[PDB]
Design a protein around this nucleic acid. Structure first.
Lengths: 100, 50, 77, 63
RNA sequence: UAUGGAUUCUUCACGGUAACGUAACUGAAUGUGGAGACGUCGGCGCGAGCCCUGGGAGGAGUUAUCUUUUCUUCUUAACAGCUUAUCACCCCGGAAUUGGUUUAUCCGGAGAUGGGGUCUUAUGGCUGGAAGAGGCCAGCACCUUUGCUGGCUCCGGUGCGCUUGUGACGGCCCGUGAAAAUCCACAGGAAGGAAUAGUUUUCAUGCCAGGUCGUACUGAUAACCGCAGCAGGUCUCCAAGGUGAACAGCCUCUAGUUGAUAGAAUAAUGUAGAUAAGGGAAGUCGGCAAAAUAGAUCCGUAACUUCGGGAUAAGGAUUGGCUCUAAGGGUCGGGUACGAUCAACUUAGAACUGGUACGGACAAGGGGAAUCUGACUGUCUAAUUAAAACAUAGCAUUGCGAUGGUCAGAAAGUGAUGUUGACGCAAUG
RNA sequence: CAAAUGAGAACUUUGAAGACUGAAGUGGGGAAAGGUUCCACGUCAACAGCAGUUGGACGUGGGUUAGUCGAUCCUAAGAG
RNA sequence: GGUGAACUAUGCCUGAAUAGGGUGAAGCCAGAGGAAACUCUGGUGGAGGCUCGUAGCGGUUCUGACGUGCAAAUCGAUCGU
């Protein structure tokens, strides 16, 4: 009911490469993740926390790794980072952005 | 047919062995007129019809 | 192909004199979502059949593996 | 070269059709040397031979 | 072929009221029973697979803009154990105010309803097989034999869905829809055995062996037959999505092909498709060929008739999109009359809307009034005649009671009808 | 369309396109029949009614593994 | 004096195959009218050498194509079932 699913994304490789802004990516995440069908209605349901190099999305409402990969793909397509970075899950809910 | 009999397979084997051209050396025998195998068979040309 | 339920039937099956191989399989499963327990399957290979004794307790499995005579060829996998 | 055998073998080895088997046009020599199922497996693992993606048949309009 | 288990001072077992249950639990001749062993159609039920579909765990696509989005993996075999069944059967009890009950109307004092049980294991579930496999991912060491290392492989829902299997039924027949090998069982009670031992290899475990022949591939616009790598012919299984009534036509997925001598040009005449102002069969032997009609819903439907039909008669209208409305269901209870969750597609209305268009492609009856003729369905001149010809049911006639009628055979201690018997067989119209 | 192969490419191979069969298929198997056409290597004289470096062609080989699939067993119409 | 039923004709034995619709037979359930006899209505049901129409089987017309053909009988449309 209040089970908190945590999805972590490792942005260390693009951060070190210098072509990624984790803060902007996270901001895009909060302002584009839609709850119940509409964006911004995350009434303290999902949160995004940034440590500078690893962005963690915790959720109590409906949210999925497929959703997160879709959002990340949309952001990298908006920023033209596709064909350069891949979104890959090392472990369950342990995704990362791989460069090489 | 895949489900053959032993007689049919024996005929198969005999025709398979007979279907070969003249050895290169018999053509060089003395007083020899045989130039080529005149009893050659292709599965398309002539049916064994057994 | 035959599943063994009792330890006593397992231990009278061990001493049947037609057993040559005993394979032990270690399994991870789910008792509760937060408590994934370990299961042990002792697969004794007789002539006609393969008997499989199942244990969901690590301690009982340890005691069984100890009480098993070392003469039998045990493949742990 | 003539990689008909290799294409048939790749389809059989990797479980899709010859229409989905993709052979690298720049490794023609390597594929030509590959004349066993084991060598075709080496190639598919090396990425010289790649399973084409399934042609999309979306059900979105139907839904 | 031995060990365990079973069975003995009541020698060849106990239990259950019973249906019957169990790990076993002697059983000869002889006899009997069952399985093998059976058509087709219809609807209904259940299951498998497939289709569809929600969440989640991965990979791929699109991303000017939108889409928690589009596509894809998330599998469980034979076999062993437990369990699970409609139908049947048993026990108690004794029923009209008849009740139970099917989609379909049959069942009950020859014992219904109700309550409690027994059984078949089709079928499903769990466990073993078995995750160690398969699949989906990620990574590592690289003229390296090539492997190894981490994760995941989860949980649901629905249906007049499609196909297959199964079950309980119902319809049909002057048609009632194989045999045998094999296997089991029962009846009977021959033989033999018990107190230091025996009985079974229909209980469990254990040991040995399983010969011979076929097996590749095509199975057809190129592996077969047609003189051929021939537009011909030749038996069968599996069968995704959309539209739609639809294994129609039309477009896609998996899979498979992209093979038919080509290049240039676009004359006449062709072959195959089309369109035509006004007229509308004046053409012609003849409306030949073509056109017109066409799906669904609603309305209306004549003569005649063997009352079943004719009939989709004839003849009219509507049909899109969008936003709504309404009706039609399954799952829980008050101290032993109020509500909540969800699939799902049918039907009927209301606005609004548009170059009045809407079965928008595909698909898809022209109709009527008569005459001749054959009742009909059916059959034939493969390769010029499909008909009014043949057949047919119906009707009628004929022979024959078996040492017989009709018909075979050169004969026969030979045959068909005939595994037959006048409600039959045979011969005719 | 391009590349590779080759003396030579409309026809071979690979990649990219565009298509079609459209699950009572041009797919996956089989029965009869065929008989090695299966597969690899080499090769183009003849054959594939154009071509051919390709092939069901030519040359050389390799390949069909069963107690459980089928025959074998049974009987049917019938044969004898 | 021999050889043919691998085509085809006809029995027999053993197997297999055949969308979706229209009509709506018997049987059964309820209701209405009537003094009665009975008559009528609505459902249900799923019959038929029934019907529209695929696969299949056949071959009407074009007297179409072809007619030194794809073919010593085929091709296309239209048709019968």
């Amino acid at each position: 009911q209040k089970i908190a699913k945590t999805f972590t994304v490792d942005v260390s490789s693009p951060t070190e490469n210098g072509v990624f802004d984790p803060a902007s990516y996270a901001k895009y995440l909060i302002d584009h993740i839609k709850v119940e069908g509409a964006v911004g209605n995350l009434g303290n349901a999902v949160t995004v926390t940034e440590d500078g190099t690893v962005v963690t999305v915790v959720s109590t409402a409906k949210f999925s790794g497929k959703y997160l990969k879709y959002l990340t793909k949309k952001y990298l397509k908006k920023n033209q980072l596709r064909d350069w970075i891949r979104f890959v899950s090392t472990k369950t809910n342990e995704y990362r952005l791989a460069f090489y | 047919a895949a489900q053959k009999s032993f007689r049919i397979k024996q005929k198969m084997a005999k025709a398979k062995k007979q279907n070969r051209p003249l050895p290169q050396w018999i053509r060089l025998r003395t007083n020899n007129t045989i130039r080529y195998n005149a009893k050659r068979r292709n599965w398309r040309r002539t049916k064994m019809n057994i | 192909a035959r599943e063994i339920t009792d330890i006593k039937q397992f231990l009278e099956l061990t001493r049947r004199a037609d057993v040559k191989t005993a394979t032990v399989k270690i399994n991870k499963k789910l008792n509760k979502a937060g408590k994934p327990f370990r299961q042990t399957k002792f697969k004794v290979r007789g002539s006609s059949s393969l008997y499989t004794l199942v244990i969901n307790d690590a301690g009982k499995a340890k005691k069984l593996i100890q009480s098993l005579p070392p003469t039998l060829k045990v493949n742990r996998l | 070269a003539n990689l008909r055998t290799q294409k048939r073998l790749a389809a059989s080895v990797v479980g899709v059709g010859k229409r989905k088997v993709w052979l690298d046009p720049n490794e023609t020599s390597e594929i030509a040397q590959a004349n066993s199922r084991n060598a075709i497996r080496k190639l598919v693992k090396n990425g010289t031979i790649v399973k084409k993606a399934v042609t999309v048949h979306s059900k979105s309009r139907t839904r």
